[PDB]
Each structure stands twice: as C-alpha cells, then as structure tokens.
Write a protein that binds this ligand. Structure first.
Ligand SMILES: O=C(O)[C@H]1O[C@@H](O[C@H]2[C@H](O)[C@H](O)[C@H](O[C@H]3[C@H](O)[C@H](O)[C@H](O[C@H]4[C@H](O)[C@H](O)[C@H](O[C@H]5[C@H](O)[C@H](O)[C@H](O)O[C@@H]5C(=O)O)O[C@@H]4C(=O)O)O[C@@H]3C(=O)O)O[C@@H]2C(=O)O)[C@@H](O)[C@@H](O)[C@@H]1O
Ligand SMILES: [Ca+2]
Ligand SMILES: [Ca+2]
Ligand SMILES: [Mg+2]
Ligand SMILES: [Mn+2]
Length: 770
C-alpha cells in the first residue's frame, strides 16, 4: 500500500516550545480557574456537565492497592491503567474547582503510580493488548493533564518522581511509535497526539523537541493518507471520532502552550461531519463504522471568524454548534458514551473546558445538496431540518479505497427519510473487527447497494485516485450527479488480473427533492453476470416481480415508515429475494430482506426508482416502459406524472411522452398534464408529447423549471466548449434578459426560441415579458 499518493493534508512538523514550563497551561492558566469554576451556571448544558464531573465515582472509589500482573486478562489490565489515569485527572480537576485536600492527595498518589505494574513488560503489537498504543494515548493525556493541573501544589520530591514516570512513557512511546503503528491508521495518529501532549506538558525536559517533532511527523502520515483535504476520513465516522478523542485535546494543548494554532488547517474535518449528517445528525455506517454523532461543539469556539459555504452570512462556529445539539442522542442512552474509549476518556471534563455557551446555534440556509468530489462523497438533501419526516437524504458513496477498515462500497448509497434509516450500508460488523462474519459478509460488495460483474466489485481505476464525477446539477426541483468506477482495477487485497474489462456509470437523480432514481450504464468487453443489490435497512421486505416494499416500525433509529422500490428492465432481469445482516451499532445485528436483480449481458442498463413513504401513504403507480435500446418508466405520485429514460448512446429514441438523444432524461407534469420540469444528460433535443422543448448544436447537460411563464430557471452542468442552446418560449411571449451566474449573456429570438451561446455552466434565468 502506497501511503503518500492520496490528496490529504499535513501541518508543520517543526517543534515549537515556550521558553519555560507554565502549570497550569494545557487547557487554561491560573487566571482562568475561577471563571471555569463559575462556568457551571452559564446554561442547562454546563449544569448537567458539572452534575456528571462532580459526582464521578473516580472521586469516591478506593485507589486500587491490587496492581495486576502481566498474566491477568487483557480487559482487567486495560481498566487498571484506565481507572488510574481517570483517578488522576478527575481528582486534579476537582482540587482546582473546590480546593478539597482529599482530591490533591488522591491525584498525587495516582500520578505517583502512573504506568506502575506490568505495562513495560508486555507487548502492544500483540492484538487486543491490555496496553495497546490506542489506550495509552488517552492514559498519557489523562495523567499529563492531571500533572499540569496539580504541579504547582506538589513537593519538590513528588514533582521529580511524577516527572520521571511521564518522561519514561514519553521515551517508550517515542521509540516504539512506528513499531506499534507500522501503517499510518488511527493506531499511529492517536498515541502520536498522546506523545504531543506529554512533550508540551514537559516542555523543559531535554527530549521534548525530539518527542514533539516525531508526534507531528507520525500524525501527518495519518492526515496525508486516511484524511482528504476536504475533511473526509477513510476509516469512517467511528474511527474519525476515536481519532478526535486524542486529536481535539492536542490541537488545544499546542495552541494554549506554544501559540501554534492548527484549527484553520484541521477546519474541513469538522465541516465534513455537518455535510454528511442525516436528518437526525448521525454520520453514516460506511466502512468499519456504526452511526455516530460529530462532537463539533468541542471546537466551535475556534471557528468564530471562519467563513463556511453552509451559510450566506453566519460563521462556521454557529453551524458547528447547531449540528451537535441538533442530533438525536437516544441511541447512546442511558450510558451516553459515543467516543469508543468509555474505559479511558474524560469526555464530561473535556466538554466542560471546550463548550462555549455564547455561540448561537444557527441552521445552514444554503441548498442541502453538497458535492465533495475530491474525497468522492455527495449528499442529495431536501432541507437541513432536524427530526423532520418531510426531509430526504441520500449519501452517494464513491471514495478511493484505503488499506485499513475498508468495505467494498463503490457507487453505493444510503437513504434517510420519514425520520427512518431506509436503503442501507449493512454496517461495521456484529460486534468487533476480529469476527469472521465481518470478512465473510459485512465488508463484502454484496452487503451493499452496488452492481457486481461476475461477483467482482466496482473499484478504483488506480490506487488513491477518487472515482470521477460528472454532470453535478443542484436545483429547487431536481438534483443529479454520475460517478464512474471500473471492475478490472485496483482494490485490497491486491488482485492484478481479471477475465474481462468493464465499468459502471451510476447516475443518481432527486426528482421533486422527494424520491430517487438510480440509472446505471454498464460496459464490458465480454458477456458477464451483473448483480444489482438493494438493502432496505431494517424493514419487513414484501412484494413480487420488479417491486419490493420494506416496512419499518418505531425502532431505536427512526419511526414507522416504508420504502417502495421498482427495478427496470422488468423483462431482461430476474429478481432473487435474499436475507442478510444489517447493523447500525455494536451487538444490535439482525437479518432482513434484500433484492438481487440479475442480467447476463455485455453492455446493458439498470434503473432503480426508490420512494420513501410515511406508514399509510399511497404506493405510487410505476410502469416499466423499457425496450431494446431504452430503459426507464413513469411514476404517478401525488397526481403528477414523472417520466425517466436511460440509453447507452446519443441516438434519437422515445419512451412514455419523451423523445430525446440524451443518455438520461427526466420530466415532471402537474395535475393538468403540462410539462413543468425536465433534465437531460448530454442531449441535443427533447420533445414532450411530440412538442420540441429545446435543441442544441452540441450535447448539453442541464435541468430547467418552466412552471412560471414569466421566468424559466434552472442550471447547466460544467462545459468543455461553447454550446448554442435554443429553448422554446411560452407561445407569443418575448425574451427580456438571460442571466447565467448573475451576469447577462447575449440572446436572440428565432421562431419562438431563446438562442444563447453558453461557454461555462451555472444557474440560468430566462426572463420573459408579455
Ligand atoms: O467505548 C465504547 O463505547 C466501546 O468501545 C469499544 O472499543 C473499541 C473502539 O471503539 C474501536 O473499535 C477500537 O478499534 C481497534 C480495534 O479494537 C482493533 O484493535 C482493530 O484491530 C486492527 C487494527 O485496526 C489494524 O487493522 C491492525 O492491522 C495490523 C494487521 O493485522 C497487519 O498485520 C498489518 O500488517 O499490520 C497492522 C498494524 O498496523 O498493526 O490489526 C488490528 C487487529 O487487531 O487485527 O483496530 C481498531 C483501530 O483501528 O484502532 O477497538 C476498541 C475495542 O476495545 O474493541 C469497546 O471497548 C467496547 O467494549 C465499548 O463498549
Ligand atoms: Ca470503501
Ligand atoms: Ca437541491
Ligand atoms: Mg497494536
Ligand atoms: Mn459496509
């Protein structure tokens, strides 16, 4: 695996340390302490956070006089060092906050027994080790923080003892960082930031410059490979948050101690979370990942002067604050831990010290639809409303495979709508990474919403190269994008030769921002077996032929609802009911229906029509009109007739009322059976009921709303060269202006048609008189 070719990001590796150690200074200086004590009375959140911290059993539990030996169980060794680190930090904090004698004594004794017992005897490369690098990253930050807090109140003797313990662990971590995490995943990054905290806590110690330099070096191998510039993490939401437990603290530690502010550089990893969140503020169960909330509140304070694309006027800080608190947290009751470190973390404290009660929660006001083409994700999204059933969310997953915690999920999608999780990623596993069922099922292509050719999964052209995206179109009435993966390409484990050569070109469209169309073009050099899968998450599957209906109930993830799905073409394809596991969180796995549509062919097409519905909604009337060269049909939902059409060539053909040379075409009628909205992929004409709507001298991809006869408005996808578009005016009405990207462009009117040269794409308004 090549770890240096992915379009990630890295910061300065130059170690910056202050002239002289200051304690406290990691989170705050001496001056801040009475402000922090008072903080508990700002709002109901700071109140709850204080209620939790001040009643922590780590203040009242007996410091254990039972040091466990090397040959004890891996769990008990974990919890010993976890509890000790926790006893140190919780007590050290509560001494600052109350001044109670006991708390200083407990903190001091716990810090004096930091990394006592068998830790340095044992081997962390061993799998699941009680002292694995990932756990002693949290421990290191817990003890180092505890020290920074109690250091002033220590005898010259106790200071020198505790300094030598933290300074040992620091040297051990420095020496064995790359041995423990030989590949740059979260097992390298987490303990690296752990070292970073230690280096900054003991800034005077002679080795600190070397410690911090490696800490930043090792961290940068993670951000260069597993992170994208645009903020995507390739280990998925779960290991993103697991990474945050150690990163977020270090980010603050290095600012507060050395005046090195990395928050601008790490900005996009927090924006990302908000962009891929569903109706209830959950990050998706993609790659080795459960559903996860994004702790964006704990960094909001640093982005008060940061612009975002997510609001016209407001600053990122306000959106980051909005995102966290607009998250359903019921899937983590009554415990409340979503970090992945519930044996080690001090999340109540770290939230107390980071939360800023002065930041106004502001909902994004921009188009919900977002195209993050650099990583390869894309979200169709009707609105940003929290826990609204009228909301529609589709994640379109086309991300270059990484070498750790990977699932085969190219051109997969998931859907959130009617407040339920519908079309599904089958999720991480039953429970853990080392389970057979993860390799035999959960990570396999078939456990996802893909198309396999002879069982081979759609994959990257070349390693660390994001699947190409085309025809990005966002509007009020219809969004659209296509992604291209290949079958005979690059994946993990590495597989150099294939019996054939083929590719998938999956287009997704968002008709009436209400339901979805998934229109696949498939090309191959040989005849092969295309298998389309469609998992309906955790629903009772029913229905025969080309139609399936998943019915959901009030579960731990949403409300009573249903998803209806039709597959085209009906005749050339066969439909196979199958049963597979779907898991959104540890231990909560179950078997559910999933559809296997199958064709045997060389070059062919599929089309899925997928419709979220509320429990007792009428099932739309969906008619297949597919033939030899043309796949597509008609949907009659809420008294409007939508028509879809795909083909493999720019060849004049018909379906329903459409006639076009476009590889894809969409139409919306109103109650009165008049064309209102239409979109085309690389068309040069479209007739509806045999009435021409537009023509062009070259192939153009655009969507247009023609429901208002004073103004036609839509968008035109990116252009390679000047096109002469000609749109038909409403009968006997003159064109006044044409606006593309808020600038006028030159227009004539010939035979009832507005005529424009367009050399770049963007939002178009054709403005009409009377
Ligand atoms: O607090 C809670 O809510 C629950 O937390 C639970 O803790 C979980 C965490 O949430 C994470 O899932 C954490 O992630 C670990 C995971 O436990 C495993 O250790 C897994 O193991 C593999 C590594 O990821 C990595 O792939 C490694 O690769 C090797 C590979 O074999 C090969 O030889 C190659 O050449 O070398 C590499 C290498 O670099 O070493 O193999 C590891 C393996 O063991 O197979 O890694 C993840 C990770 O990425 O960090 O796991 C904990 C956990 O304890 O389970 C849990 O405590 C639960 O009880 C709580 O309720
Ligand atoms: Ca993947
Ligand atoms: Ca839109
Ligand atoms: Mg290890
Ligand atoms: Mn998966």
């Amino acid at each position: 695996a090549n770890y240096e070719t992915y379009d990630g990001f890295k910061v300065s590796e130059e170690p910056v340390l202050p002239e002289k150690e200051v304690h406290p200074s990691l989170w705050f200086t001496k001056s801040d302490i009475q402000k922090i004590k008072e903080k508990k009375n700002e709002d109901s959140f700071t109140a709850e956070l204080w209620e939790e911290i001040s009643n922590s059993p780590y203040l009242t539990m007996e410091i254990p006089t039972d040091i466990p030996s090397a040959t004890d169980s891996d769990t008990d060794i974990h919890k010993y060092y976890g509890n000790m680190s926790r006893i140190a930090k919780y007590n050290a904090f509560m001494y600052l906050m109350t001044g109670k004698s006991e708390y200083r004594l407990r903190a001091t004794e716990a810090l004096k027994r930091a990394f006592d017992g068998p830790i340095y005897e044992m081997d962390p490369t061993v799998s699941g080790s009680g002292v694995d690098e990932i756990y002693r990253a949290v421990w290191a930050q817990n003890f180092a923080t505890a020290y920074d807090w109690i250091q002033p109140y220590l005898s010259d003797e106790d200071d020198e003892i505790i300094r030598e313990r933290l300074a040992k662990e620091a040297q051990v971590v420095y020496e064995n960082l790359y041995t423990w995490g030989p590949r740059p995943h979260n097992a390298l990054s987490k303990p690296a930031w752990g070292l970073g905290t230690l280096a900054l806590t003991l800034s005077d110690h002679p080795d600190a410059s070397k410690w911090l330099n490696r800490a930043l070096e090792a961290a940068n191998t993670n951000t260069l490979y597993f992170f994208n510039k645009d903020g995507h993490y390739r280990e998925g939401a779960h290991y993103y948050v697991y990474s945050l437990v150690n990163l977020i603290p270090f980010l603050y530690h290095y600012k507060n101690v050395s005046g090195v502010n990395y928050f601008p550089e790490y900005k996009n990893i927090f924006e990302w979370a908000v962009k891929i969140r569903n109706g209830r503020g959950w990050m998706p169960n993609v790659e080795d990942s459960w559903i996860k909330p994004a702790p964006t509140h704990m960094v909001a304070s640093q982005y008060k002067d940061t612009d975002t694309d997510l609001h016209s006027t407001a600053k990122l800080a306000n959106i980051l604050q909005w995102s966290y608190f607009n998250t359903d947290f019921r899937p983590w009751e009554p415990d409340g831990s979503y970090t992945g470190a519930s044996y080690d973390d001090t999340w109540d404290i770290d939230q107390y010290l980071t939360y800023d009660s002065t930041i106004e929660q502001i909902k994004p006001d921009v188009s919900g639809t977002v195209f993050m083409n650099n990583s390869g994700q894309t979200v169709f999204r009707s609105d940003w409303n929290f826990n609204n059933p009228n909301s529609r969310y589709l994640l379109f997953q086309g991300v270059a495979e990484a070498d750790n915690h990977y699932h085969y999920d190219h051109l997969s999608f998931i859907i959130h709508a009617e407040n339920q999780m519908m079309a599904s990623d089958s999720g991480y596993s039953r429970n853990s990474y080392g389970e057979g069922i993860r390799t035999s099922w959960y990570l396999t292509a078939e456990a996802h919403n893909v198309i396999t050719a002879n069982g081979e999964h759609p994959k990257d052209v070349s390693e660390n190269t994001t699947p190409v995206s085309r025809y990005d179109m966002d509007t009020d009435f219809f969004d659209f994008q296509e992604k291209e993966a290949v079958y005979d390409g690059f994946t993990f484990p590495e597989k150099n030769s294939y019996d054939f050569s083929g590719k998938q070109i999956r287009a997704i469209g968002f008709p009436r921002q209400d339901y979805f169309v998934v229109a696949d073009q498939l090309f191959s050099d040989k005849e092969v077996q295309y298998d389309l899968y469609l998992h309906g998450g955790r629903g009772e599957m029913s229905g025969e032929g080309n139609y399936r209906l998943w019915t959901y109930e009030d579960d731990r993830y949403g409300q009573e609802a249903k998803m209806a799905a039709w597959v085209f073409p009906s005749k050339e394809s066969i439909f196979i009911d199958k049963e597979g596991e779907v898991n959104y969180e540890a231990g909560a796995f179950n078997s559910y229906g999933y559809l296997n549509a199958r064709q045997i062919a060389k070059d062919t097409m599929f089309m899925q029509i997928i419709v979220p519905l509320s429990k007792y909604a009428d099932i739309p009337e969906v008619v297949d009109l597919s033939t030899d060269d043309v796949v597509g049909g008609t949907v009659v939902k809420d008294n409007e007739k939508d028509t879809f059409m795909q083909q493999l060539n720019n060849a004049e053909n018909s379906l329903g009322d459409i006639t076009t040379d476009a590889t894809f075409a969409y139409t919306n009628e109103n109650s009165n059976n008049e064309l209102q909205h239409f979109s085309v992929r690389q068309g040069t004409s479209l007739d509806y009921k045999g009435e021409n709507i537009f023509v062009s001298n070259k192939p153009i991809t655009f969507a247009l709303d023609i429901s208002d006869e004073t103004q036609y408005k839509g968008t035109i996808a990116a252009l390679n060269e000047t096109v002469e578009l000609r749109v038909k005016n409403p009968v006997g009405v003159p064109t006044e202006s044409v606006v593309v990207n808020g600038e006028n462009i030159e227009f004539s009117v010939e035979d009832g048609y507005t005529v424009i040269q367009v050399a770049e794409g963007g939002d178009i308004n054709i403005n009409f008189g009377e």
